[PDB]
Design a protein around this ligand. Structure first.
Ligand SMILES: CC(C)(COP(=O)(O)OP(=O)(O)OC[C@H]1O[C@@H](n2cnc3c(N)ncnc32)[C@H](O)[C@@H]1OP(=O)(O)O)[C@@H](O)C(=O)NCCC(=O)NCCS
Ligand SMILES: C[N+](C)(C)C[C@H](O)CC(=O)O
Length: 599
């Protein structure tokens, strides 16, 4: 972003070694046995002793911090995404469901699409001019680098690891977006020769041409290839671009500012599962027979406009986290609600270029394989969308409690009620108060949360007592949160010590091969919060086979929830987890209301 802004932001620190180990042991207590904790406790002591292994690694991390803008940046990007070989679909690229629009016909669909496109270009103007407003979190300025990674970017399949291309600041920045309809991609210029952006009416005109240029799905769904395994896609991709035309098509897609997907009509399903299917449409596309082929999952920003008024998006996670994405969403949506000014006449426009694809037997085979793979992934995904209307941030605040911590503690209660034990829980924490900061880990399963969940279901404990336990659990979580955003958490630190050990060419420390660490990093509950003014919600698949993927948008009077799980694991059920979460949130409200503090 603006160099001046970034230069004033503090650099990502390296927490004290003994401090992070202390927090690590405390976070382990509720998720490991006494025997395992006692064992880990010894490993830690040895690990941190004077002249020991841990001390040498810590020294290394500190040297890394003095010779890089961010000691964690590249390591995280690589281990978290670039070296993650599983398909980006469902497993990595988050999905977003925006408020359903009111258009009732094709003209309306394109009308909103044209407006949305223009709204993105308006937001993009603040990026190209570095005039984008500064953001705060803990009362500190926030890194804006992510905003310069989302547009005109695209992920690239790699045989060993993937890469990312960014053309935003290239010699001649892209002035075109890509539009996908019935599996056919089109190169659409959204800027005039003089350098001014096209109008909503103009973009609309072009969308019509594009639409009439792909009235049937008689073209192979090449884009579906991008949903396969990264290793497989890498090879299929390397073959695909061997044709001049093909490479030219891919290149355009990769350089486009962003992609707009004009999805087709889907089988009218029951209302009790509608929202869930829409979530799937945005996350993976529904399937090869639906809209999955009308995508390109390597593209950083993909906006989706359904035929039934439904809309949303899916973005490639390597570029950024949710906050930056939603800020863009809020702006665009708020822009689509701008009263159309005086309609001015527009001269003829050029015919959007069609990004053709030369299909061969080999490519054909790759596509079919991609279909099979994607079909398996979809059939194994269990999603449950829950709109908590009972209340939002309003109640927790009236109780002088952090809404997020209230929600997280509720999740801990729900889980414990189902399984009778706590589990490694992950909650995304933003590290943007630091230059190039991405995220750190907040562990919702703690000593205090466990004391609460247990006492909560103990029919021998006074309600007055459960209240104290609840508030203490919430406060403990808020304290952990404050430390996380300030770079005082330990997960990224411990990861850094591990990677540092590898780089130093020393044997892998036992502390990292310890059972407790394996358990601590196996997140049965992987969660995050993505605030927004728009009544939208995000979702992603679980990070472990036997876990859940839970995301939410805490609003004032309600909370948009999303719960994912894998059908391959009989011990997990999205609907059930969501139901227990809803009930846990209510029981906590009931408990607090039954015992007011004020006199
Ligand atoms: C963890 C995190 C979400 C916490 O955010 P937060 O804003 O502190 O959440 P809280 O629930 O504490 O605060 C929400 C609201 O309740 C208020 N509040 C908090 N504690 C309160 C209390 N004890 N009493 C009254 N009000 C309180 C806050 O002021 C805020 O007010 P607002 O509604 O006017 O904005 C944030 O620090 C973070 O890391 N966000 C990034 C997560 C991310 O990266 N997500 C995407 C991953 S891909
Ligand atoms: C979905 N989840 C929590 C696994 C990944 C987050 O979106 C990103 C992060 O916390 O680094």
């Amino acid at each position: 972003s603006h160099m001046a802004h970034q230069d004033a932001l503090p650099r990502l620190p390296v927490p004290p070694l003994q401090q992070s180990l202390d927090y690590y042991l405390k976070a382990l207590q509720p998720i490991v046995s006494e025997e395992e904790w006692a064992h880990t406790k010894q490993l830690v002591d040895e690990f941190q002793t004077s002249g020991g292994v841990g001390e040498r690694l810590q020294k290394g991390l500190e040297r890394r911090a003095k010779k890089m803008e961010n000691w964690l940046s590249e390591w995280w990007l690589k281990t978290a995404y670039l070296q993650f070989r599983q398909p980006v679909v469902i497993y990595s690229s988050p999905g977003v469901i925006l408020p359903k629009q009111d258009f009732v016909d094709l003209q309306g669909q394109l009308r909103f699409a044209a407006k949305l496109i223009e709204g993105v270009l308006d937001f993009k103007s603040m990026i190209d001019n570095e005039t984008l407003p500064v953001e705060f979190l803990g009362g500190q300025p926030l890194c804006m680098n992510q905003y310069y990674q989302i547009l005109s970017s695209c992920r690239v399949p790699g045989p060993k690891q993937d890469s990312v291309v960014n053309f935003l600041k290239s010699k001649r920045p892209p002035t075109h977006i890509t539009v996908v309809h019935n599996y056919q991609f089109f190169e659409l210029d959204v800027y005039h020769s003089d350098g001014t952006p096209l109008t909503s009416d103009q973009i609309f005109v072009q969308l019509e041409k594009i639409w009439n240029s792909s009235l049937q799905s008689n073209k192979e769904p090449v884009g579906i290839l991008t949903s396969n395994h990264r290793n497989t896609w890498a090879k299929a991709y390397n073959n695909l671009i061997k044709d001049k035309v093909n490479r030219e098509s891919v290149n355009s897609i990769q350089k486009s500012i962003f992609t707009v997907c004009l999805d087709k009509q889907v089988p009218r399903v029951s209302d009790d599962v509608y929202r869930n299917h829409v979530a799937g449409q945005m996350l993976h596309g529904g399937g090869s027979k639906f809209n999955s082929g009308n995508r390109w999952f390597d593209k950083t920003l993909q906006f989706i406009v359904a035929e039934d008024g439904s809309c949303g998006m899916v973005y490639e996670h390597a570029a950024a986290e949710g906050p930056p994405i939603v800020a863009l969403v809020d702006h665009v949506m708020e822009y689509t609600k701008k009263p159309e000014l005086v309609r001015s006449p527009m001269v003829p426009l050029p015919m959007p270029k069609k990004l053709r694809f030369n299909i061969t037997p080999e490519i054909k085979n790759d596509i079919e394989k991609a279909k099979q793979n994607l079909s398996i992934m979809i059939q194994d995904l269990d999603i449950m969308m829950l709109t908590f209307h009972h209340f939002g941030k309003d109640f927790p605040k009236s109780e002088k409690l952090s809404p997020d911590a209230f929600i997280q503690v509720a999740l801990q209660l729900a889980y414990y009620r189902i399984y009778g034990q706590a589990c490694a829980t992950y909650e995304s924490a933003s590290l943007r108060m630091f230059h190039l900061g991405r995220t750190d880990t907040i562990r919702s399963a703690s000593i205090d949360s466990l004391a609460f969940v247990k006492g909560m279901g103990d029919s021998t404990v006074p309600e007055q007592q459960k209240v104290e336990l609840l508030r203490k659990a919430v406060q403990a979580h808020r304290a952990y949160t404050d430390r996380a955003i300030r770079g005082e958490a330990f997960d990224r630190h411990l990861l850094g010590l591990k990677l540092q050990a590898i780089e130093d060419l020393v044997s892998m420390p036992d502390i990292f091969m310890d059972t407790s660490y394996a358990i601590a990093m196996h997140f049965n509950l992987s969660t995050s919060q993505v605030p927004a003014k728009t009544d939208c919600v995000m979702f992603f698949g679980p990070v472990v086979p036997d876990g859940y993927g839970i995301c939410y948008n805490p609003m004032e009077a309600h909370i948009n929830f999303s719960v994912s799980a894998y059908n391959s694991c009989a011990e997990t059920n999205a609907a059930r987890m969501a139901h227990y979460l809803e009930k846990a949130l209510l029981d906590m409200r009931t408990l607090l209301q039954n015992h007011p503090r004020a006199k």
